[PDB]
Amino acid sequence: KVRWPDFNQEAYVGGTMVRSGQDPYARNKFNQVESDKLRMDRAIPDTRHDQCQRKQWRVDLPATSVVITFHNEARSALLRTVVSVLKKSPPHLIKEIILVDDYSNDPEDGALLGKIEKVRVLRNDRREGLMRSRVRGADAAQAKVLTFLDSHCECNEHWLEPLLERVAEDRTRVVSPIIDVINMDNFQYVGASADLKGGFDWNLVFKWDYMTPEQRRSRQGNPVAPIKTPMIAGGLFVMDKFYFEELGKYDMMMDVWGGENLEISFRVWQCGGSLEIIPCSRVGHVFRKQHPYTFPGGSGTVFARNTRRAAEVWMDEYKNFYYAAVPSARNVPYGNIQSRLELRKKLSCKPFKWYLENVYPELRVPDHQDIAFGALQQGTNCLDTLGHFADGVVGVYECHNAGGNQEWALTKEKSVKHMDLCLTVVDRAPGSLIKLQGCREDDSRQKWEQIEGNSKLRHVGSNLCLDSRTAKSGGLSVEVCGPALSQQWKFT
Amino acid sequence: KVRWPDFNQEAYVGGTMVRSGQDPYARNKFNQVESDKLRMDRAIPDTRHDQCQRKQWRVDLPATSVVITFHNEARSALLRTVVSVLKKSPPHLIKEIILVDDYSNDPEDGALLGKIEKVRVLRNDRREGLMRSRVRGADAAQAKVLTFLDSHCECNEHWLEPLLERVAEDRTRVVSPIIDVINMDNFQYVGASADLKGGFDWNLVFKWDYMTPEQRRSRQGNPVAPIKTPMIAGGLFVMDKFYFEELGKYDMMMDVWGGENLEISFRVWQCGGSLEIIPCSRVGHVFRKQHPYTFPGGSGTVFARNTRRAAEVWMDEYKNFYYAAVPSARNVPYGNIQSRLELRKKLSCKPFKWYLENVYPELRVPDHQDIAFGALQQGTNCLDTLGHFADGVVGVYECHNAGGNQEWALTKEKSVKHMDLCLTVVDRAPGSLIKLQGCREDDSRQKWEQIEGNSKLRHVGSNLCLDSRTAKSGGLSVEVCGPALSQQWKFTLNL
Ligand SMILES: O=c1ccn([C@@H]2O[C@H](COP(=O)(O)OP(=O)(O)O)[C@@H](O)[C@H]2O)c(=O)[nH]1
Ligand SMILES: O=c1ccn([C@@H]2O[C@H](COP(=O)(O)OP(=O)(O)O)[C@@H](O)[C@H]2O)c(=O)[nH]1
Numbered sequence: 001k002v003r004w005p006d007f008n009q010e011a012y013v014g015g016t017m018v019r020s021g022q023d024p025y026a027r028n029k030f031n032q033v034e035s036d037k038l039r040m041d042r043a044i045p046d047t048r049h050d051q052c053q054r055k056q057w058r059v060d061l062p063a064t065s066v067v068i069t070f071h072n073e074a075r076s077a078l079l080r081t082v083v084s085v086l087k088k089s090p091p092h093l094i095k096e097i098i099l100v101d102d103y104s105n106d107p108e109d110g111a112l113l114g115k116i117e118k119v120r121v122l123r124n125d126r127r128e129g130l131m132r133s134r135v136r137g138a139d140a141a142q143a144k145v146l147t148f149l150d151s152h153c154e155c156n157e158h159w160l161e162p163l164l165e166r167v168a169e170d171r172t173r174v175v176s177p178i179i180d181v182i183n184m185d186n187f188q189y190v191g192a193s194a195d196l197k198g199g200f201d202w203n204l205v206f207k208w209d210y211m212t213p214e215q216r217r218s219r220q221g222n223p224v225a226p227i228k229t230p231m232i233a234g235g236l237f238v239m240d241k242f243y244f245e246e247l248g249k250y251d252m253m254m255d256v257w258g259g260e261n262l263e264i265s266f267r268v269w270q271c272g273g274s275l276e277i278i279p280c281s282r283v284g285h286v287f288r289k290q291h292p293y294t295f296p297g298g299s300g301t302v303f304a305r306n307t308r309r310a311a312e313v314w315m316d317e318y319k320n321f322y323y324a325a326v327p328s329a330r331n332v333p334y335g336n337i338q339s340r341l342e343l344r345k346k347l348s349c350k351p352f353k354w355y356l357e358n359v360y361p362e363l364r365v366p367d368h369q370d371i372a373f374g375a376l377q378q379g380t381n382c383l384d385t386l387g388h389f390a391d392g393v394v395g396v397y398e399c400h401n402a403g404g405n406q407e408w409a410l411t412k413e414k415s416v417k418h419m420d421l422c423l424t425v426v427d428r429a430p431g432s433l434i435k436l437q438g439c440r441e442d443d444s445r446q447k448w449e450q451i452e453g454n455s456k457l458r459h460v461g462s463n464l465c466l467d468s469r470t471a472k473s474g475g476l477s478v479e480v481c482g483p484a485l486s487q488q489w490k491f492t
Numbered sequence: 493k494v495r496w497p498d499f500n501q502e503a504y505v506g507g508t509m510v511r512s513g514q515d516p517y518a519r520n521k522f523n524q525v526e527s528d529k530l531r532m533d534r535a536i537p538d539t540r541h542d543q544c545q546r547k548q549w550r551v552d553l554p555a556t557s558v559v560i561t562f563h564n565e566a567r568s569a570l571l572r573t574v575v576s577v578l579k580k581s582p583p584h585l586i587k588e589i590i591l592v593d594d595y596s597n598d599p600e601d602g603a604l605l606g607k608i609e610k611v612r613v614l615r616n617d618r619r620e621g622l623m624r625s626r627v628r629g630a631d632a633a634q635a636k637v638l639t640f641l642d643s644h645c646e647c648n649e650h651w652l653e654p655l656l657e658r659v660a661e662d663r664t665r666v667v668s669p670i671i672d673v674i675n676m677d678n679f680q681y682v683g684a685s686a687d688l689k690g691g692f693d694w695n696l697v698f699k700w701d702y703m704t705p706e707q708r709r710s711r712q713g714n715p716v717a718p719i720k721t722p723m724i725a726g727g728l729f730v731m732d733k734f735y736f737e738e739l740g741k742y743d744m745m746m747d748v749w750g751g752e753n754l755e756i757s758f759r760v761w762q763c764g765g766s767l768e769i770i771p772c773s774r775v776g777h778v779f780r781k782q783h784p785y786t787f788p789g790g791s792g793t794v795f796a797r798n799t800r801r802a803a804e805v806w807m808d809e810y811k812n813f814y815y816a817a818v819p820s821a822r823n824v825p826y827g828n829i830q831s832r833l834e835l836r837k838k839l840s841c842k843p844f845k846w847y848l849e850n851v852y853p854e855l856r857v858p859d860h861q862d863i864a865f866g867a868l869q870q871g872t873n874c875l876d877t878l879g880h881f882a883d884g885v886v887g888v889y890e891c892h893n894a895g896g897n898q899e900w901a902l903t904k905e906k907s908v909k910h911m912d913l914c915l916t917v918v919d920r921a922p923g924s925l926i927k928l929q930g931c932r933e934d935d936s937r938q939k940w941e942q943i944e945g946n947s948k949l950r951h952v953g954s955n956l957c958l959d960s961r962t963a964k965s966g967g968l969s970v971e972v973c974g975p976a977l978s979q980q981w982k983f984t985l986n987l
């Protein structure tokens with residue numbers, strides 16, 4: 001067994017290098033030439049808040065077993081992940097690093113790293129995916145605490161202690177670092193924002209939200225305190241090993257990638273635990289836009305199956321909002337979920353409604369009877385209040401997909417509302433400007449209907465259509481319904 | 493004295509009507525022909541939330557003295573204001589209606605209304621303005637509670653009781669209705685949004701803000717509860733008369749119009765009271781875009797003087813952010829403020845910092861050492877994160893004056909930050925996209941400086957300037973500094 005600095009990087013990485021004139025992105029969907037130029041222990045900036053840097057860390061903490069699964073990872077990235085763990089962590093807190101080789105083309109990618117101090121490799125005999133691979137690693141772990149990392153990460157200074165501190169104090173906390181960005185094109189290590197929480201839209205796709213201004217102000221007195229998060233990214237976290245086992249590990253029927261982060265996040269929160277982001281812990285990750293590896297049956301379908309298994313188990317009736325956003329998903333078969341359902345019963349988990357009220361209250365929930373919702377689009381332009389209030393005109397600006405003044409709904413009452421203001425036909429003469437006024441269910445002047453395959457908006461009981469021809473010279477108007485481009489509007 | 497329905501509207505309004513062929517907007521800056529067509533007690537829609545419509549209050553409420561000041565008001569609007577008070581209020585709660593005629597051209601506009609039940613008229617011998625006029629009315633008032641209304645309002649159903657209920661329960665509350673819109677062109681009465689609070693930007697100009705999503709959720713269990721507001725619009729409110737006197741009435745040196753709403757709002761909050769909007773109370777107001785009346789020295793100057801008197805007394809150091817937004821104001825003389833300053837001392841009022849933390853925390857406040865702040869504007873476009881986070885490109889969208897992704901600062905450390913992300917020069921080759929990255933004081937790639945009279949942004953120690961030419965085809969870039977329009981950028985506040 002070899003100490004990490006004595007490992008021959010050139011011998012390991014050389015041989016698998018990008019051949020003169022070939023595509024440097026095809027193998028990994030990140031730039032392998034830039035990854036391969038880097039030293040295995042390359043220096044990275046210290047992206048931690050200044051208060052983290054002066055803190056002296058407890059080291060009388062339980063040791064962890066680090067589990068890293070991989071399938072056809074670039075050698076340089078995989079080695080660098082392993083050495084960042086070894087170099088940046090107090091040695092007595094790294095029990096072992098378990099590499100789960102998930103049926104990589106070349107078994108040597110993993111096996112050669114087995115010579116490094118503390119590294120143990122487990123090879124899957126066939127492709128199993130990240131969920132089953134992680135469980136295999138977790139089942140082999142000897143330590144009290146599990147750390148999961150992707151195979152293209154770089155740990156920053158004193159990344160580990162702040163995470164272990166949390167779980168040592170309360171075993172029901174599942175904790176994450178701030179995930180810095182390793183640029184997929186140039187491999188620069190870039191400090192992320194510390195002001196984010198994880199979350200998702202009803203399509204169940206992970207996204208980062210900024211904290212609210214009031215959340216940020218409430219932290220001004222300790223800006224590096226833990227941040228409770230509705231959802232973790234899912235690749236990088238630390239969890240008490242027995243807690244992981246007792247909560248049901250992962251759903252063993254999820255395949256290759258996607259959705260397991262949903263499932264564990266809902267499960268942890270609903271069943272009595274918590275999820276945190278720990279600002280003093282910084283780890284870089286190579287974010288990419290595309291997957292480099294195979295999906296048995298296409299990635300659209302596998303993601304949908306995994307996501308459905310999460311939704312059917314955890315979301316109660318709120319699953320229907322997922323299906324409302326992704327109707328294609330109702331047709332993807334998902335398999336037996338009985339063991340998961342009984343796991344939920346066994347654990348006395350709270351309902352999804354509780355999750356929404358107590359964990360993720362800032363997730364906007366549709367009125368069950370809303371007809372349409374979101375932005376109202378015409379070309380690249382979007383219906384916009386222009387910051388106006390009651391008795392104000394309405395207009396368009398370029399769609400920014402950020403809500404605010406471009407948030408609308410078509411209601412059960414047939415009104416096109418923003419907040420409690422409704423598009424109002426003040427005057428039926430063609431060319432008359434429409435106005436924002438307080439919504440009233442009885443006001444016929446506020447009734448609208450979609451027509452011509454949800455491509456236009458007609459004022460109910462008239463032949464007037466919403467029209468943008470005067471938008472930059474007074475505001476939106478009502479015009480006689482006709483073939484013009486200025487009367488095309490679609491909710492999205 | 494005559495009951496309001498026996499008052500001859502046609503005789504009062506007729507004679508001052510818009511003369512055959514003349515401009516119907518010149519006299520009032522609203523459409524006088526449309527105002528004059530209306531009955532004095534015309535029906536208006538009930539714009540109250542449904543819960544208001546079935547609601548009881550206490551019922552032993554203190555009566556109010558209604559004060560309405562006016563200068564050259566349209567007779568039809570003035571009459572209609574008075575009759576809406578008389579018709580829509582329980583008679584035992586209207587002690588009197590005091591009309592303060594602030595030196596109108598024709599003294600008969602007011603005097604003729606003196607024949608109406610409960611109406612008392614006080615004429616100023618010279619022009620005094622709304623602040624001094626209100627105080628005169630308040631000083632004449634006999635009731636426990638004051639109600640101030642403009643001379644072109646229309647009270648809606650059960651407008652008064654919900655307001656009096658609040659001040660009867662706690663005399664330190666100064667309370668307002670939701671102010672519905674009476675359209676200045678057609679005089680239609682339009683229901684306003686109930687989801688607003690008053691506020692202001694650093695230019696100290698009143699504006700309406702939507703409540704936050706978390707404020708709205710916390711009200712889901714009683715959607716017509718009082719709404720605490722950092723600032724009132726200022727025309728329409730109710731206040732315990734003794735509380736009004738004890739807090740210092742209004743600043744008697746403010747002239748004609750503007751700024752008194754700032755001053756009373758800061759004073760009430762800082763000195764122990766509160767400000768509320770009461771959704772069950774609805775009153776329409778003729779909003780207009782221009783003033784119909786004279787300002788001794790121009791309206792820009794009078795507004796600035798009044799505003800400065802508010803700022804110098806109440807805002808402590810935060811006045812400098814007002815001056816940073818309106819540098820022209822540092823040159824407007826404001827007069828002696830000593831009585832106001834001692835009033836502040838006498839009352840043990842809290843500092844403006846307290847106001848910002850506890851009353852108006854959603855007003856974005858620059859760091860004391862920030863160089864510049866706000867939006868970064870180029871024409872009608874604004875620097876925008878595009879919802880991106882670290883390692884993301886940056887761009888522009890049309891300025892929406894709503895903060896969010898168009899909020900920036902130029903810091904003590906020379907960085908252009910949004911949240912804890914900073915514009916970062918990743919690559920110095922001209923045309924290279926800039927990126928958002930976590931702010932670090934040591935990173936020379938994040939240093940920027942204003943040049944050419946605060947009209948551009950140059951990357952420090954280079955001849956590269958922030959540039960928008962690739963904004964819709966990749967993002968903002970760094971380009972060699974030159975005379976192009978795509979390199980013009982101005983912060984809305986410069987210290
Ligand atoms: O079939 C698979 C697919 C992915 N992975 C690994 O699981 C982790 C997460 O995958 P990826 O980084 O592709 O996901 P992302 O972080 O991009 O969402 C990485 O270490 C992959 O090499 C794996 O072991 N088997
Ligand atoms: O010098 C003045 C200016 C205004 N007013 C009256 O004060 C009220 C407030 O003025 P205005 O409605 O112009 O303010 P706005 O609501 O337009 O801000 C009105 O009843 C005016 O006629 C007055 O008595 N003296």
Ligand SMILES: [Mn+2]
Pocket residue numbers: 150152235285286
């Ligand atoms: Mn990854």
Ligand SMILES: [Mn+2]
Pocket residue numbers: 642643644727777778
């Ligand atoms: Mn007014």
